[PDB]
Antibody, heavy 113, light 107 residues
Framework: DVQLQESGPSLVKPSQTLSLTCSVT????????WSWIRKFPGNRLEYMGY???????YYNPSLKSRISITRDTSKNQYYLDLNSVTTEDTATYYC???????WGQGTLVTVSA | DIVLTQSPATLSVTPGNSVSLSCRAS??????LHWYQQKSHESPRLLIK???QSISGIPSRFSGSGSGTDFTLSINSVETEDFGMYFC?????????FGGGTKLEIK
């Protein structure tokens, strides 16, 4: 099976850029489609974006252009950068395969002064 | 964007009774509607794809029906480990969006 794992900070300050890594094992990111999804502490789910097999990225307009998704095929990893974070960005960040079967364990990121 | 509305937001049921959970879309999404179960501090778990598609490993008591703008997740004879949150998600148009969820509680 595919395994996905997010890594990155647990705590960031307002206006910092939040940068996360998703490490994928057991399937290649140069085929299929790969996603970032977050769960707010009140349980609301938001689809942030995804990157296609050829590197084409799609972003939720809710993110008002603060989001970048990139990849490093040589390590089977992809990345999320989210600029100018505020307390509204406290959430659990998941990477997932775009079919929805395989998700990371999620990483909780808290934004605080 | 497509707005998914889930009603009711809370349903309390007694174990062994059946339930129907509603997800309505603001515009037509064909069959491109998926259902997830959500329990504490875990990733969402996929239950049903493409409105009615059953998937390996998910108990047979879960099924989905509907099309267009009106969808239902049915759980036949609810079990206590089914209590928790349920979300629908459309993939018909970007951005993909989730309903606000229905919490299933023990009556």
């Amino acid at each position: 099976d595919v395994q996905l794992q997010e890594s990155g900070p647990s705590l960031v300050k307002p206006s910092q850029t939040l940068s996360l890594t998703c490490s994928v094992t057991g399937d290649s990111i140069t085929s299929d489609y790969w996603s970032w999804i977050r769960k707010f502490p009140g349980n609301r789910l938001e689809y942030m974006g995804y990157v296609s097999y050829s590197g084409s990225t799609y972003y939720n307009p809710s993110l008002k252009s603060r989001i970048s998704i990139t990849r490093d095929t040589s390590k089977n990893q992809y990345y999320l950068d989210l600029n100018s974070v505020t307390t509204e960005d406290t959430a659990t960040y998941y990477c997932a395969n775009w079919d929805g079967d395989y998700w990371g364990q999620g990483t909780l990121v808290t934004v605080s002064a | 964007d497509i707005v998914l509305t889930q009603s009711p937001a809370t349903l309390s049921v007694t174990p062994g009774n059946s339930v129907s959970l509603s997800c309505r879309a603001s515009q037509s999404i064909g069959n491109n509607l998926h259902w997830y179960q959500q329990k504490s501090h875990e990733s969402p778990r996929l239950l049903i794809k493409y409105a009615s598609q059953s998937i390996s490993g998910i108990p047979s008591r879960f099924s989905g029906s509907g099309s267009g703008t009106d969808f239902t997740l049915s759980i036949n004879s609810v079990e206590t480990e089914d209590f928790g949150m349920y979300f629908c998600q459309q993939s018909n148009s970007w951005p993909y969006t989730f309903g606000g969820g229905t919490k299933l509680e023990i009556k």
